[PDB]
RNA sequence: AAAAUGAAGACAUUUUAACGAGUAAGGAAACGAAAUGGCGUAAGGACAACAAAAGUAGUAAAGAUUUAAAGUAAUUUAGAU
RNA sequence: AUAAACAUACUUUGAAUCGGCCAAGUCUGGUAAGCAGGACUGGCGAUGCGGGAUGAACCGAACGUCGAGAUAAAGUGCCAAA
RNA sequence: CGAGAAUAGAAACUCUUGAAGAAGUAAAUUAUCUACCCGUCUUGAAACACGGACCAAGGAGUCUAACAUGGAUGCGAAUGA
């Protein structure tokens, strides 16, 4: 036998699209072209967020896009996700591309100018991405993540799943 | 042209002390006892079925004359094979009457396919007929 | 069996140096340390108001605070199958400066008086000096030859035995 | 039915599997339990900066 | 097009005179130096060995942790798997705490050659490529100024300016088996066992085990 | 057993770097010799490997190993009751022939194993200096005796059969 | 594991390299380069001769007994009675 | 100095387990124990294979199915290869 | 004498056996090597530890309810209704 510090076991990445989905199949075949073909750190980029599970792709409101956008003016946001619509505030012009748009989302972002695009016509017009700006939602914002750990705890107490007698 | 198809292992894995008693049959099961003489790998007792006994990926399946098996129940199924009558050998099924084994063994040799039960349900002509 | 008082064993650890009793330096209450500084831990059992615990004892650690009278020494503890940070705030009485890094901040200046040299040279345009070579592991000797003329050769040879008694 | 009553067999090959975990960078870079005046004056330099950052952006 | 192809060969060429012009001019001044220490009556000592062949004696069952780890730093994690160890004040005592596990001395020019050209191979993307053309050397080795496979032999043997990265590209060579030992592998070389320095004496072992 | 001359010196703040050591030291092979050589050093003049250099390790050879001489070995060997100084005599053509039977000698004799055994030195005695009561005998001009009771002498293992016809024969020789 | 190729070929693709002991225990299903791969029992919804008679079956079903073949194996397939 | 990108840092969720026993260029109680209890490490448990005739722990060495070779412990009168 | 380079050349074969049964495979017997009783508790069982004479059929992590994590899915300041 040989003195290995570890047996080989399976990298903890994801490859593909996760499901049975037959349209998220086959942007990560278009990617995953891409990616290989024209070797841009973009495209890998985006291949690798195409495979995160649903809890890893964090929905981006509108109201994130209005303010990382404010001084890219002809650019497009980037993110694989939903994105959702913040009713509190105003949608400037922009472009987004994204995997998902919600109905009051995508009817904002239009009646101020804007374009609602998919992760197709990015890469028939972008491939190698040119003038994007990529964004991904933030993940620390899930009320799950209150409950982790110890709540007897001095320095970071856990949020003590409610239950009997709960005080 | 016909590989050569290797088996690594002739014999039949039979399961442990089904030669001593009635009730254990012979298909194999893993002893999963703490003292087992076979899962510990004993000399003598050391033959248990692992993946390295696995045939060639090029001859796995392969029947002995060569080609593959293709279970066929009407004369529309051989027409599925045809174009691969050097890959494929027909296989009339076990159900099928012995006048439609007449059909798919006539039509059969109309295509060029390799029927394997050409000798099957036959009618009394053997003996003074 | 030991007990598990603060101060169990010891009986030789807390004693004080051999003919080194009663009060210490001025130059322990003298010293002047600032945030970043390397210090051993040494409790001094001659002061047993703000004795550090005896798992501390013989520590380097770092300062990370100056307090009045008190300075914050930060040390790297042992648990279970971790390292945590314990931070404590201990008078100069049981801390000493240490000189874990007196080579390095000499190759430190070393280096930079070269430096120094040579952005005045580069302005006269004479070619400026190479940085001091790095350390290595002893190396292995080179050939070298040895003059016959101041030589003297000494046979060794095995022993005879003879008895201590 | 007396029992062996401890022993520290085993011990270090188990805190070795996982090995020792250090501490994180900003372990070392907590701020609590620093002197009160250097508090002081950090958060008073702080207060001046972000102030004039803010009114330069008012600006522009 | 393929006129690189031409002008790699005789680069090739050249280097490989370079090499041994190197090799020989050493071997001429060691050589002239100890004629002329006769003729003056003088004691001339030679120079210290640089490079050592190590070859790991003893299996992987029973190691203390210690050991164990100075074995993976070695790179001997294999029984009859042999390295070459720059030799200095740091590997020397890290040799001398593992000298029941591994044998070892100073390799000689044919030894290195004969490792290298039989057993060589590369780690080319996590990949334990054997050695087959001066094309692959060039494209791992090329920016460490080590265009073939002579310039390896030479930089090994030599222990140049590039030995840490050219050593490391060098997977460990695996080995054969041989007669190890006069008693057994259980006492040094020294008491007529297996284990521990045999100076120049590693090469019949070697020799054996190619 | 072979023959090495070896020097070497000392390099550091306790001894001179004049003074030269040297020693003709028994051993298999020049490993060995420097291994018992550096023992020596440690073991009489607090000088380790790593404070030193050796200078020379080169075999020496009978000058005429043809010769028939009366070899006088003094050594020391340590046993269950403590250490004696012991002296022995052999009739050998070399040095090291004789070194060795000294040590095969000692193996037998007195059960000790090599590694007990420091041979102090080996010098060459007269004819008449010989007080071995059994190598005496061999030592005077008329040595005369009829080797009985001969096996006889197969000439190469090729001729070895495991049974021979007829009968078998001792040789007067 | 990494490269290459990739609407359907096929054997769950091609090449290269490393690796393969194991009680307790874990590895649900789906996921094209698939986040382990499969065998078996019974019932339910579909599909099963594409040109308007469309899986097999009194020209012999299921079951039983054996003989051979395929599979590392769980098992499957076919012949004869 | 050496090694390290299928490196490194982990996060969540959860199983089983916390009767252990052996060795020794170790220790304590005991006259002593195949006794009781410990420090460090390697093992057996969980482990087959070659050797010690036999053997949980010794020695060599850890295991996909095979072919040809050099070997390890240890052996070479026969049983038994030399 | 001769590396590179330039110029030109020369390799596609015999024999034996096989439907009067080749190669392979299977079955029975013989021979050499090889093989302690399975399950379980246990530090440790082939144990002078317990259950087991034999065969067939039945036979043991299920259902309802609350919470949580996680993989797939819909919508998203709403979701369910």
Known sequence: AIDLDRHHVRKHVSKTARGNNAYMKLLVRLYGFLARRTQSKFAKTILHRLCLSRVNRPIVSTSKLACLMKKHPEETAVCVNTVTYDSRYPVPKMNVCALKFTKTAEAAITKAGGKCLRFDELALKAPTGRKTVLIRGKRNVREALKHFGKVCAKKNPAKQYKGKQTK | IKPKIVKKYTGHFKRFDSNRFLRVKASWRVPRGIDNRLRRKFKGTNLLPKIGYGSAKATRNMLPCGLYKFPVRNTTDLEMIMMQNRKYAAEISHAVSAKKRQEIIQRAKILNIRVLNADARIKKQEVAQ | ?165 | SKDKNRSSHNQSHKAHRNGFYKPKKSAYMSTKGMNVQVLKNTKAQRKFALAKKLEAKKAA | ?210 | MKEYYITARCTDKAHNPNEIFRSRVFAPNYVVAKSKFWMMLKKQHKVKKINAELLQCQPIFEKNPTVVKNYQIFLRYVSAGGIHNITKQYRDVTRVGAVRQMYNDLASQYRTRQDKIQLISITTVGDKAVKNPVLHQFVGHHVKFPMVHCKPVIASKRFNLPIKAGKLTTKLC
């Open chain 5, 1 to 210: 097009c393929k006129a690189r192809c031409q002008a790699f060969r005789k680069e090739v060429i050249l280097r490989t005179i370079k090499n041994h012009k190197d090799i020989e001019a050493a071997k001429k001044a060691v050589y002239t130096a100890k004629k002329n220490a006769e003729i003056n009556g003088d004691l001339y000592a030679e120079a210290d060995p640089k490079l050592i062949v190590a070859i790991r004696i003893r299996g992987i069952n029973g190691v203390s942790p210690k050991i164990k780890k100075i074995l993976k730093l070695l790179r001997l994690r294999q029984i009859n798997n042999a390295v070459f160890i720059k030799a200095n004040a740091s590997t020397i005592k890290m040799l001398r705490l593992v000298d029941p596990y591994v044998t070892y001395g100073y390799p000689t020019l044919e030894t290195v050659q004969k490792l290298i050209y039989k057993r060589g191979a590369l780690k080319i993307n996590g990949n334990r490529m054997p050695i087959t053309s001066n094309c692959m050397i060039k494209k791992a080795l090329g920016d460490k100024d080590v265009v073939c496979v002579d310039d390896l032999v030479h930089e090994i043997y030599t222990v140049g300016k590039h030995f840490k990265e050219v050593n490391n590209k060098l997977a460990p060579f695996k080995l054969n088996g041989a007669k190890i030992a006069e008693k057994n592998k259980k006492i040094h070389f020294i008491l007529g066992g297996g284990f521990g320095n045999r100076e120049l004496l590693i090469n019949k072992l070697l020799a054996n085990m190619i």
């Open chain 3, 1 to 165: 069996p030991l007990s598990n008082g603060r101060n169990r064993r010891t009986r030789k650890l807390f004693k004080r140096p051999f003919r080194g009793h009663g009060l210490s330096n001025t130059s322990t209450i003298l010293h002047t340390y600032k945030v970043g500084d390397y210090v051993t831990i040494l409790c001094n059992s001659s002061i047993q108001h703000g004795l550090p615990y005896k798992a501390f004892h013989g520590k380097t650690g770092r300062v990370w605070n100056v307090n009045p009278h008190a300075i914050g020494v930060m040390v790297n503890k042992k648990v279970n199958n971790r390292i945590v940070v314990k931070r404590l705030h201990i008078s100069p009485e049981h801390i000493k400066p240490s000189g874990c890094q007196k080579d390095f901040l000499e190759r430190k200046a070393a280096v930079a008086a070269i430096r120094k040299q040579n952005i005045q040279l580069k302005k006269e345009g004479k070619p400026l000096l190479p940085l001091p070579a790095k350390r290595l592991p002893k190396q292995p000797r080179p050939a070298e030859l040895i003059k016959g003329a101041d030589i003297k050769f000494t046979t060794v040879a095995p022993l005879k035995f003879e008895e201590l008694y």
